[PDB]
């Protein structure tokens, strides 16, 4: 009967990197999705499966708010049926996706002048991620036929690389903060409701 922490997720001071993306389980609350749909902050709001208006009339078992940071060119890749470095190696969405994808520019927050090396993305991986999979492996990638045994060098690459966000880059290559809402419904008790 109390309010939902969506404010915790969106207005967070720090956001995780893409490969190590954070997930929040929202439950035992009642939430106003109107704040989200009627806001001018977002640059992208793509719901896949549900009308975000009309949402406050439903109830769900669990609503998951995933969150991370990618470059603006990658925001289109956060979607069912999509392919790219981000969709295959860092964060994948299922084809029968029931949810919404929100993104807004943050060049003023997440871009250091010399390069923000705290944001990473997985560039090497021998198999695409299954939907909703999360890989935090730091093991050196064996590109060659020769084993590396914990030492990087030629054909032995660290599997994560830095976006290196800087503010003078074009709008395309700037950090966008992304939230992904996921709605699930088992034949279990619904606890995430709306007003009235």
């Amino acid at each position, epitope marked *: 009967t109390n309010l939902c922490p969506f404010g915790e997720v969106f207005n967070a001071t720090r956001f995780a990197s893409v490969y190590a993306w954070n997930r929040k389980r929202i439950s035992n609350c009642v939430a106003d999705y109107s704040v989200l749909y009627n806001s001018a902050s977002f640059s*992208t709001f*793509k*719901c896949y*499966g549900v009308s*975000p208006t009309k949402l406050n009339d439903l109830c769900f078992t669990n609503v998951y708010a995933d969150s991370f940071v990618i470059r603006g060119d990658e925001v289109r890749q956060i979607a069912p049926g999509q392919t790219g470095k981000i969709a295959d190696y860092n964060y994948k969405l299922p084809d*029968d996706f*029931t949810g919404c994808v929100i993104a807004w520019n943050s060049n003023n927050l997440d871009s250091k002048v010399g390069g923000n090396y705290n944001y990473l993305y997985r560039l090497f991986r021998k198999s695409n991620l299954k939907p909703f999979e999360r890989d935090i492996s730091t093991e050196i990638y064996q590109a060659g036929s020769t084993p590396c045994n914990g030492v990087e060098g030629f054909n032995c690459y660290f599997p994560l690389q830095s976006y290196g966000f800087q503010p003078t880059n074009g709008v395309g290559y700037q950090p966008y903060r992304v939230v992904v809402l996921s709605f*699930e*419904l088992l034949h279990a008790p619904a606890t995430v409701c709306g007003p009235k």
Partner: antibody
Framework: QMQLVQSGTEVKKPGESLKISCKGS????????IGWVRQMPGKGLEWMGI????????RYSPSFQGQVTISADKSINTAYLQWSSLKASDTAIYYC????????????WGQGTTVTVSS | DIQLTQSPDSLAVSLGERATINCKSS????????????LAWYQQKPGQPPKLLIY???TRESGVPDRFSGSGSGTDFTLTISSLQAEDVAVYYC?????????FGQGTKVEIKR
């Protein structure tokens, strides 16, 4: 809650270009996907395609791929549908419908644009 | 690419009686995650724009009267007008929104029988 408003009646000769519009006023518009429906005289409804204004992800129906072009302008909340060469068979009324998600019913509808193509 | 069929095409039924407008699909349209099925029922009177009446198989849009009901599951769905009033006479369409390409029915022309 928001509403949709389309352009006025059109009368062209066969072969001329045309680009009709559909603008949305109201709050909650960033989420709306806008689709186009064609209705020939006395016949049923045909879904042509859909677009999202924010990034112009545009999906056509198999019957209208390459026959029309659906575009958008997110700065003015306007979706567009244009023909390169109008055919006499394009005479119909064209609605723009809006669904607040991609797999979502069209709750909000435009008023309709009647297009008559004749020599 | 999801064929859709309504039944019948005319359906002249008297004032206050029940109207049964079928609709046949061609693919199970149950999103297993929410176990809801993605079909909508629209009403259009001549010269008017189509107004959405029923979202999902049974959920009803606001401002519509209690006589309209949606039913069905799997691939067979029905819209039923319980106590027909004259102010309801129009052409009715069903549409699926499982996936692009969206598809409508052929339409059922519903009139008052006298």
């Amino acid at each position: 809650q928001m509403q949709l408003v389309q352009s006025g009646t059109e009368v062209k000769k066969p072969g001329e270009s045309l680009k009709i519009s559909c603008k949305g006023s109201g709050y909650g518009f960033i989420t709306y996907w806008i689709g186009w429906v064609r209705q020939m005289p006395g016949k049923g409804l045909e879904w042509m395609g859909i677009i999202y204004p924010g990034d112009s992800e545009t999906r056509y129906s198999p019957s209208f791929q390459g026959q029309v072009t659906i575009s958008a302008d997110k700065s003015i909340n306007t979706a567009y549908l244009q023909w390169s060469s109008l055919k006499a068979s394009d005479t119909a009324i064209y609605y723009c419908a809006g669904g607040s998600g991609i797999s979502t019913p069209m709750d909000v509808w435009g008023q309709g644009t009647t297009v008559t193509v004749s020599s | 690419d999801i064929q859709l069929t309504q039944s019948p095409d005319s359906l002249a039924v008297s004032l206050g009686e029940r109207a049964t407008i079928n609709c046949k699909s061609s693919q199970s349209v149950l999103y297993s995650s929410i176990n809801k099925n993605y079909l909508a029922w629209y009403q259009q009177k001549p010269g008017q724009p189509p107004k959405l009446l029923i979202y999902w198989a049974s959920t009803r849009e606001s401002g519509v009267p209690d006589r309209f009901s949606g039913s069905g599951s799997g691939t067979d769905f029905t819209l039923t007008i319980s106590s027909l009033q004259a102010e309801d006479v129009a052409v009715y369409y069903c549409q699926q929104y499982y996936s692009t390409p969206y598809t409508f029915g052929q339409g059922t022309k519903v009139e008052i029988k006298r």
